[PDB]
């Protein structure tokens, strides 16, 4: 997996658009939706099961976590997945992030703030990799790239992000219940 | 999986470009290449392992199997995957296609001509589904969408296309040795 392209994606700035002014699926044959907030618009690709969530028409109170791609699509700035339902109320939750270095092994523990009731895997993946780039030298060297991030739910279900490669596009639009995240366990296979 | 978008895709015309005048990967951060032949140009997305075949710069001796997408990308007509090495010899082979109707039903056999030494899964998938629409009422209506196409190779390796949904984008750029295809087996679970 191209290391230039990997760190380049995770080093990019993100745009958190809460409560979009609009989200429009022009037609079911389109593989995306036009979103806009505060006189700025974007086209957001629907490349996974997220496509089933936005039938033709307008949809209110959606959120978008954007990471702007290199490609312009339908004449607009483009991002893939990262859509979710806006919050119903003010919300913030603090979960444990436990980072383990592995062969071998005590974890380095910190806290991570969850403010969305419904959150895309794009957002969690992006923010958690930033944290690891800032705090654990992830992608700080060509050898600092192997491991996994595991988001564990209160019911013990889990979602895994493999660090040697980018999150797969068809998973960027998957969402989970942020109010039900129990903890985040990280394995780093490099020192 | 949306039936409308499924059928819309396989009903489309294809454009087969043999020996491109150019194929240009502008930069390693891009997710595609610019291709052109004669005076027509397109942008082709590299969304699977195909991305590793085209580093920055030009690449000669390539073919493109295009199916134009709804989205314009980089101000151009767009297609996903479908790239391959052009033939070095005038290779042609007639492969058996065996259609079995799996309703708990001898196979109905015909021939399918391969003219490329290396062929994208996008091209085989697309042509084989046209044949099945033309001859076996695939996507003729609702309930005419279940089954699979299996491309079998000389060493018993195989490649499968599930008919109930579109070929996955990350597989459109995968290529196989057309000279080693042994047969094509189709199981239709409808009538
Ligand atoms: C080459 C390539 O990228 N191929 C992918 C393949 O990786 C991918 O499978 C998924 O791979 C990820 C790691 O990259 C996980 O292993 C997925 O399993 C899990 C997960 O741990 O995340 C299992 C887990 O039990 C699931 N949780 C629930 C509640 O069901 C999650 C969940 O379904 C996903 O995280 C949601 O995005 O998946 C594993 O599926 C496949 C499928 O994406 O696609 C290939 O192209
Ligand atoms: C929901 C979703 O789309 N998930 C996909 C998941 O389906 C996909 O897995 C592939 O699924 C296809 C059928 O759709 C096949 O079953 C793949 O298995 C095979 C195949 O039969 O095609 C197995 C076979 O042994 C392999 N042949 C060789 C020589 O290795 C092939 C081959 O690797 C592929 O055909 C090449 O594209 O695969 C199965 O992998 C996964 C991975 O694409 O992605 C999820 O997102």
Coordinates of C-alpha atoms and ligand atoms in Angstrom, one line a residue:
Chain A
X1 CA 0.0 0.0 0.0
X2 CA 1.4 3.4 -1.2
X3 CA 2.9 5.0 1.9
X4 CA 2.8 8.5 0.3
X5 CA -0.9 8.1 -0.3
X6 CA -1.5 6.6 3.2
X7 CA 0.0 9.3 5.3
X8 CA -1.2 11.9 2.9
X9 CA -4.9 11.0 3.5
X10 CA -4.5 10.9 7.3
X11 CA -2.5 14.1 7.4
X12 CA -5.3 16.0 5.6
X13 CA -7.5 18.4 7.4
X14 CA -11.1 17.4 8.0
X15 CA -14.3 19.5 7.9
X16 CA -17.0 18.6 10.5
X17 CA -20.3 19.9 9.1
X18 CA -22.9 19.5 11.9
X19 CA -26.6 19.9 10.9
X20 CA -26.2 20.4 7.2
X21 CA -28.4 23.0 5.6
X22 CA -29.1 20.3 3.0
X23 CA -28.4 16.8 1.7
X24 CA -29.9 15.9 -1.7
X25 CA -29.9 12.6 -3.7
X26 CA -30.7 13.8 -7.2
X27 CA -31.4 10.3 -8.5
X28 CA -31.0 6.7 -7.4
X29 CA -28.6 6.2 -10.3
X30 CA -26.2 8.7 -8.7
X31 CA -23.5 7.2 -6.5
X32 CA -23.5 10.2 -4.0
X33 CA -25.4 13.2 -2.6
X34 CA -25.0 16.9 -2.7
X35 CA -24.5 18.4 0.7
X36 CA -24.2 22.0 1.7
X37 CA -23.8 24.2 4.9
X38 CA -23.2 28.0 5.0
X39 CA -22.9 28.7 1.3
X40 CA -20.4 25.9 0.6
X41 CA -21.3 22.7 -1.2
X42 CA -19.8 19.3 -1.6
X43 CA -20.6 16.0 -3.4
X44 CA -20.3 13.0 -1.1
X45 CA -19.8 9.6 -2.5
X46 CA -22.1 6.8 -1.4
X47 CA -19.9 3.7 -1.9
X48 CA -21.2 1.2 0.6
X49 CA -24.4 0.2 2.3
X50 CA -24.7 4.0 3.1
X51 CA -26.2 4.2 -0.4
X52 CA -29.4 2.5 0.8
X53 CA -29.9 5.2 3.4
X54 CA -30.5 8.1 1.1
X55 CA -33.3 7.4 -1.5
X56 CA -34.1 10.1 -4.1
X57 CA -34.9 13.5 -2.6
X58 CA -33.9 15.8 0.3
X59 CA -33.0 14.6 3.8
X60 CA -32.8 17.0 6.8
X61 CA -30.7 16.9 9.9
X62 CA -27.7 15.0 8.6
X63 CA -24.1 15.5 9.6
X64 CA -21.1 15.2 7.3
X65 CA -17.5 14.4 8.3
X66 CA -15.6 15.5 5.2
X67 CA -12.0 14.8 4.1
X68 CA -11.5 16.4 0.7
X69 CA -10.3 14.0 -2.0
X70 CA -8.0 14.9 -4.9
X71 CA -10.7 14.2 -7.5
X72 CA -13.3 16.9 -8.3
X73 CA -16.7 15.1 -8.8
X74 CA -19.8 16.6 -10.6
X75 CA -17.8 19.9 -10.6
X76 CA -17.5 20.0 -6.8
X77 CA -15.2 19.2 -4.0
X78 CA -15.6 15.5 -3.1
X79 CA -15.5 13.3 0.0
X80 CA -16.4 9.7 0.5
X81 CA -19.0 8.5 3.1
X82 CA -18.9 10.1 6.5
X83 CA -22.6 10.9 6.7
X84 CA -24.7 10.4 9.8
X85 CA -27.8 11.6 11.7
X86 CA -27.4 14.8 13.6
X87 CA -27.7 14.7 17.4
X88 CA -31.1 14.9 19.1
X89 CA -29.4 16.5 22.1
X90 CA -26.1 17.9 23.6
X91 CA -23.9 14.8 24.0
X92 CA -20.4 14.0 25.1
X93 CA -18.9 10.7 26.3
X94 CA -15.4 9.9 27.4
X95 CA -14.1 6.4 26.6
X96 CA -10.8 4.7 27.4
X97 CA -8.3 4.4 24.6
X98 CA -5.8 1.7 25.6
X99 CA -2.6 1.6 23.4
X100 CA -0.5 -1.6 23.5
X101 CA 2.9 -2.1 21.8
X102 CA 3.7 -5.6 20.5
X103 CA 6.7 -9.5 20.2
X104 CA 5.4 -9.5 23.9
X105 CA 3.2 -5.3 27.5
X106 CA 1.3 -2.8 29.7
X107 CA -1.0 -0.4 27.9
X108 CA -0.7 3.4 27.7
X109 CA -4.2 4.6 28.5
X110 CA -5.9 7.9 27.6
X111 CA -9.4 9.2 27.0
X112 CA -11.2 10.0 23.8
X113 CA -14.2 12.3 23.5
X114 CA -17.4 11.1 21.7
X115 CA -19.9 13.9 20.9
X116 CA -22.1 12.4 18.3
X117 CA -24.9 10.0 19.0
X118 CA -24.4 8.5 15.5
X119 CA -20.9 8.4 14.1
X120 CA -19.3 7.2 10.8
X121 CA -16.4 4.8 10.8
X122 CA -14.7 7.4 8.6
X123 CA -14.7 9.9 11.5
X124 CA -13.5 7.5 14.1
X125 CA -10.8 6.0 11.9
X126 CA -9.6 9.5 10.9
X127 CA -9.6 11.0 14.4
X128 CA -8.1 7.9 16.1
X129 CA -5.3 7.7 13.5
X130 CA -4.5 11.5 14.1
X131 CA -4.3 10.8 17.8
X132 CA -1.8 8.0 17.1
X133 CA 0.2 10.2 14.6
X134 CA 0.4 12.9 17.3
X135 CA 1.0 10.6 20.3
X136 CA 2.5 7.3 19.1
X137 CA 4.5 8.3 16.0
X138 CA 2.1 6.4 13.6
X139 CA 3.4 6.9 10.1
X140 CA 6.3 8.9 11.6
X141 CA 8.7 6.5 9.8
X142 CA 8.2 4.1 6.9
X143 CA 8.3 1.3 9.5
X144 CA 5.6 2.9 11.8
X145 CA 2.5 1.6 10.1
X146 CA 1.5 -1.9 11.4
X147 CA -1.3 -2.5 13.9
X148 CA -5.0 -2.1 14.6
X149 CA -7.6 0.0 16.2
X150 CA -10.6 -1.8 17.7
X151 CA -13.7 0.1 18.7
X152 CA -15.6 -2.0 21.2
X153 CA -19.3 -1.6 22.0
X154 CA -21.2 -2.0 25.3
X155 CA -22.7 -5.3 23.9
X156 CA -19.1 -6.5 23.0
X157 CA -19.6 -6.1 19.2
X158 CA -16.6 -4.4 17.6
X159 CA -15.2 -2.5 14.6
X160 CA -11.6 -2.9 13.4
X161 CA -9.3 -0.5 11.5
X162 CA -6.1 -2.0 10.1
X163 CA -3.3 0.5 10.2
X164 CA -1.2 -0.7 7.2
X165 CA -3.9 0.5 4.9
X166 CA -6.5 3.1 4.5
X167 CA -10.0 2.4 5.8
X168 CA -11.8 0.7 2.8
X169 CA -14.1 3.1 0.9
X170 CA -17.2 0.9 1.3
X171 CA -16.8 1.1 5.1
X172 CA -16.4 4.9 5.4
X173 CA -20.2 5.4 5.3
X174 CA -21.0 2.7 7.9
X175 CA -22.2 4.2 11.2
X176 CA -22.4 3.2 14.8
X177 CA -24.2 4.3 17.9
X178 CA -21.7 6.6 19.6
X179 CA -23.6 6.5 22.9
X180 CA -22.8 2.8 23.0
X181 CA -19.0 2.7 22.5
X182 CA -17.4 1.1 25.5
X183 CA -13.7 1.4 24.8
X184 CA -11.0 1.6 22.1
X185 CA -8.1 -0.9 22.1
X186 CA -5.1 -0.2 20.0
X187 CA -2.3 -2.6 19.0
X188 CA 0.9 -1.1 17.6
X189 CA 3.4 -3.5 16.1
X190 CA 6.4 -1.1 16.2
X191 CA 8.3 0.8 18.8
Chain B
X1 CA -29.2 -3.8 -3.8
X2 CA -31.1 -1.3 -5.9
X3 CA -32.5 -3.1 -8.9
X4 CA -32.9 0.1 -10.9
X5 CA -29.2 1.0 -10.5
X6 CA -28.1 -2.6 -11.1
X7 CA -30.0 -2.8 -14.4
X8 CA -29.0 0.7 -15.4
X9 CA -25.4 -0.3 -15.1
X10 CA -25.5 -3.5 -17.2
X11 CA -27.9 -2.0 -19.8
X12 CA -25.3 0.7 -20.6
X13 CA -23.1 0.6 -23.7
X14 CA -19.4 -0.2 -23.3
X15 CA -16.5 1.4 -25.1
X16 CA -13.5 -1.0 -25.8
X17 CA -10.3 1.0 -26.5
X18 CA -7.4 -1.1 -27.7
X19 CA -3.9 0.2 -27.4
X20 CA -4.5 3.6 -25.8
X21 CA -2.7 6.7 -27.2
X22 CA -2.0 7.5 -23.6
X23 CA -2.6 6.6 -20.0
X24 CA -1.3 9.1 -17.5
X25 CA -1.1 8.9 -13.8
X26 CA -0.7 12.6 -12.9
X27 CA 0.3 12.0 -9.3
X28 CA 0.4 9.2 -6.6
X29 CA -2.2 10.9 -4.5
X30 CA -4.8 10.6 -7.4
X31 CA -7.3 7.7 -7.5
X32 CA -7.2 7.3 -11.2
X33 CA -5.6 7.9 -14.6
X34 CA -6.3 9.9 -17.6
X35 CA -6.7 7.8 -20.7
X36 CA -7.3 8.8 -24.3
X37 CA -7.3 7.3 -27.8
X38 CA -7.8 9.2 -31.0
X39 CA -9.3 12.5 -29.8
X40 CA -11.4 11.2 -26.8
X41 CA -10.3 11.2 -23.2
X42 CA -11.6 9.8 -20.0
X43 CA -10.7 9.6 -16.3
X44 CA -10.5 6.0 -15.1
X45 CA -10.8 5.3 -11.4
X46 CA -8.2 2.9 -9.8
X47 CA -10.1 1.7 -6.7
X48 CA -8.5 -1.7 -6.0
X49 CA -5.1 -3.3 -6.3
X50 CA -5.0 -1.9 -9.9
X51 CA -3.8 1.3 -8.3
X52 CA -0.3 -0.3 -7.8
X53 CA 0.1 -1.0 -11.5
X54 CA 0.2 2.7 -12.5
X55 CA 2.7 4.9 -10.7
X56 CA 3.3 8.5 -11.7
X57 CA 3.8 9.3 -15.4
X58 CA 2.8 7.7 -18.7
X59 CA 2.2 4.0 -19.4
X60 CA 2.0 2.5 -22.9
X61 CA 0.7 -0.8 -24.3
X62 CA -2.6 -0.6 -22.3
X63 CA -6.3 -1.2 -23.2
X64 CA -9.4 0.2 -21.5
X65 CA -12.9 -1.3 -21.2
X66 CA -15.1 1.7 -20.4
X67 CA -18.6 1.9 -19.0
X68 CA -19.5 5.6 -18.5
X69 CA -20.5 6.4 -14.9
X70 CA -23.2 9.0 -13.9
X71 CA -20.6 11.1 -12.2
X72 CA -18.3 13.4 -14.1
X73 CA -14.8 13.2 -12.5
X74 CA -12.0 15.8 -13.0
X75 CA -14.2 17.4 -15.7
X76 CA -14.2 14.2 -17.7
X77 CA -16.4 11.2 -18.5
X78 CA -15.6 8.5 -15.9
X79 CA -15.3 4.8 -15.7
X80 CA -14.1 2.4 -12.9
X81 CA -11.3 -0.1 -13.5
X82 CA -11.3 -2.0 -16.7
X83 CA -7.7 -1.4 -17.6
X84 CA -5.3 -4.2 -18.9
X85 CA -2.2 -4.9 -20.9
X86 CA -2.8 -4.8 -24.6
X87 CA -2.2 -8.1 -26.6
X88 CA 1.4 -8.9 -27.6
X89 CA 0.1 -11.6 -30.0
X90 CA -3.2 -12.1 -31.9
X91 CA -4.7 -14.2 -29.3
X92 CA -8.2 -15.6 -29.7
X93 CA -10.0 -18.4 -27.8
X94 CA -13.5 -19.8 -27.9
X95 CA -14.5 -20.7 -24.2
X96 CA -17.4 -22.9 -23.2
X97 CA -20.2 -21.2 -21.3
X98 CA -22.4 -23.6 -19.5
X99 CA -25.7 -22.4 -18.1
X100 CA -27.5 -24.4 -15.5
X101 CA -30.7 -23.5 -13.9
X102 CA -30.6 -24.3 -10.3
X103 CA -34.2 -24.8 -9.1
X104 CA -34.7 -27.9 -7.0
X105 CA -32.7 -29.2 -14.0
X106 CA -28.5 -30.6 -17.8
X107 CA -26.7 -27.4 -18.8
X108 CA -27.4 -25.2 -21.8
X109 CA -24.0 -24.7 -23.5
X110 CA -22.6 -22.1 -25.9
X111 CA -19.3 -20.4 -26.7
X112 CA -17.8 -17.1 -25.7
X113 CA -14.9 -15.5 -27.5
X114 CA -11.9 -14.2 -25.7
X115 CA -9.5 -11.9 -27.7
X116 CA -7.4 -10.6 -24.9
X117 CA -4.3 -12.1 -23.2
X118 CA -5.1 -10.1 -20.1
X119 CA -8.6 -9.2 -19.3
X120 CA -10.3 -7.1 -16.5
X121 CA -13.0 -8.7 -14.3
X122 CA -15.0 -5.6 -15.3
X123 CA -15.0 -6.6 -19.0
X124 CA -15.8 -10.3 -18.4
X125 CA -18.5 -9.4 -15.9
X126 CA -20.1 -6.9 -18.1
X127 CA -20.0 -9.0 -21.3
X128 CA -21.1 -12.2 -19.6
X129 CA -24.1 -10.4 -17.9
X130 CA -25.1 -8.9 -21.4
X131 CA -25.1 -12.4 -22.8
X132 CA -27.2 -13.6 -19.9
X133 CA -29.7 -10.7 -20.3
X134 CA -29.8 -11.3 -24.1
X135 CA -30.2 -15.1 -23.8
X136 CA -31.3 -16.1 -20.4
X137 CA -33.6 -13.2 -19.3
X138 CA -31.2 -11.8 -16.8
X139 CA -32.7 -8.7 -15.2
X140 CA -35.7 -9.0 -17.6
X141 CA -37.8 -8.3 -14.6
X142 CA -37.9 -8.7 -10.8
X143 CA -36.8 -12.1 -9.5
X144 CA -34.5 -12.5 -12.6
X145 CA -31.3 -11.5 -10.7
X146 CA -30.1 -14.4 -8.5
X147 CA -27.2 -16.7 -9.4
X148 CA -23.5 -16.5 -10.3
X149 CA -21.0 -16.5 -13.1
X150 CA -17.8 -18.6 -12.3
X151 CA -14.8 -18.1 -14.6
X152 CA -12.7 -21.2 -14.2
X153 CA -8.9 -21.3 -15.0
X154 CA -6.7 -24.1 -16.3
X155 CA -5.2 -24.7 -12.8
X156 CA -8.5 -24.7 -11.0
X157 CA -8.3 -21.2 -9.7
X158 CA -11.6 -19.3 -10.2
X159 CA -13.3 -15.9 -10.2
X160 CA -17.0 -15.4 -9.2
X161 CA -19.6 -12.8 -10.1
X162 CA -22.7 -12.7 -7.9
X163 CA -25.6 -11.7 -10.2
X164 CA -27.8 -10.3 -7.4
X165 CA -25.5 -7.2 -7.2
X166 CA -23.0 -5.2 -9.2
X167 CA -19.4 -6.2 -9.5
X168 CA -17.7 -4.6 -6.5
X169 CA -15.7 -1.5 -7.4
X170 CA -12.4 -2.8 -5.9
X171 CA -12.6 -5.9 -8.2
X172 CA -13.3 -4.0 -11.5
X173 CA -9.5 -3.4 -12.1
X174 CA -8.4 -7.0 -11.2
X175 CA -7.1 -8.8 -14.3
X176 CA -6.7 -12.4 -15.3
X177 CA -4.8 -14.4 -17.9
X178 CA -7.3 -14.8 -20.7
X179 CA -5.1 -17.5 -22.2
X180 CA -5.7 -19.7 -19.2
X181 CA -9.5 -19.5 -19.0
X182 CA -10.8 -23.0 -19.2
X183 CA -14.5 -22.5 -19.0
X184 CA -17.3 -20.3 -17.7
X185 CA -20.0 -21.8 -15.5
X186 CA -23.3 -20.1 -14.8
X187 CA -25.9 -21.0 -12.2
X188 CA -29.2 -19.2 -12.5
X189 CA -31.5 -19.5 -9.5
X190 CA -34.6 -18.3 -11.3
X191 CA -36.8 -19.2 -14.2
Ligands
LIG1 C1 -8.3 -6.1 0.9 C2 -9.5 -5.6 1.7 O1 -9.4 -4.5 2.3 N1 -10.5 -6.4 1.8 C3 -11.7 -6.1 2.5 C4 -11.8 -6.8 3.9 O2 -10.8 -6.4 4.7 C5 -13.2 -6.5 4.6 O3 -13.4 -7.3 5.7 C6 -13.3 -6.5 6.9 O4 -12.0 -6.3 7.3 C7 -11.9 -5.5 8.5 C8 -10.5 -5.1 8.7 O5 -10.0 -4.4 7.6 C9 -12.5 -6.3 9.6 O6 -11.8 -7.5 9.9 C10 -14.0 -6.6 9.4 O7 -14.6 -7.5 10.4 C11 -15.4 -6.7 11.3 C12 -14.5 -5.7 12.1 O8 -13.7 -6.2 12.9 O9 -14.5 -4.5 11.8 C13 -15.9 -7.8 12.2 C14 -17.0 -7.3 13.2 O10 -17.6 -8.3 13.9 C15 -18.0 -6.5 12.5 N2 -18.9 -5.8 13.5 C16 -20.2 -6.0 13.5 C17 -21.0 -5.3 14.6 O11 -20.8 -6.7 12.7 C18 -17.4 -5.4 11.6 C19 -18.3 -4.5 10.8 O12 -19.1 -5.4 10.0 C20 -17.4 -3.6 9.9 O13 -16.3 -3.1 10.6 C21 -18.3 -2.5 9.2 O14 -17.5 -1.8 8.3 O15 -16.5 -6.0 10.7 C22 -14.1 -7.3 8.0 O16 -15.4 -7.4 7.6 C23 -14.3 -6.7 3.6 C24 -15.6 -6.2 4.2 O17 -15.5 -4.8 4.5 O18 -14.1 -6.0 2.4 C25 -12.9 -6.5 1.7 O19 -12.9 -5.8 0.4
LIG2 C1 -20.7 -7.1 0.5 C2 -19.5 -7.4 -0.4 O1 -19.5 -7.1 -1.6 N1 -18.4 -7.9 0.2 C3 -17.2 -8.1 -0.5 C4 -16.9 -9.6 -0.7 O2 -17.9 -10.2 -1.5 C5 -15.6 -9.8 -1.5 O3 -15.3 -11.2 -1.4 C6 -15.4 -11.8 -2.7 O4 -16.7 -12.1 -3.1 C7 -16.8 -12.7 -4.3 C8 -18.2 -12.9 -4.8 O5 -18.8 -11.6 -4.7 C9 -16.0 -14.0 -4.3 O6 -16.7 -15.0 -3.6 C10 -14.5 -13.9 -3.9 O7 -13.9 -15.2 -3.7 C11 -13.1 -15.4 -4.9 C12 -14.0 -15.7 -6.1 O8 -14.6 -16.8 -6.2 O9 -14.1 -14.8 -6.9 C13 -12.5 -16.7 -4.4 C14 -11.4 -17.2 -5.4 O10 -10.7 -18.4 -4.9 C15 -10.4 -16.2 -5.8 N2 -9.6 -16.6 -6.9 C16 -8.2 -16.5 -6.9 C17 -7.4 -17.0 -8.0 O11 -7.6 -16.1 -5.9 C18 -11.2 -14.9 -6.1 C19 -10.4 -13.6 -6.4 O12 -9.5 -13.4 -5.3 C20 -11.3 -12.4 -6.7 O13 -12.4 -12.8 -7.6 C21 -10.6 -11.3 -7.4 O14 -11.5 -10.1 -7.4 O15 -12.1 -14.5 -5.1 C22 -14.5 -13.0 -2.6 O16 -13.1 -12.7 -2.3 C23 -14.5 -9.1 -0.7 C24 -13.1 -9.2 -1.5 O17 -13.3 -8.7 -2.8 O18 -14.8 -7.8 -0.6 C25 -16.0 -7.5 0.1 O19 -16.1 -6.1 0.2

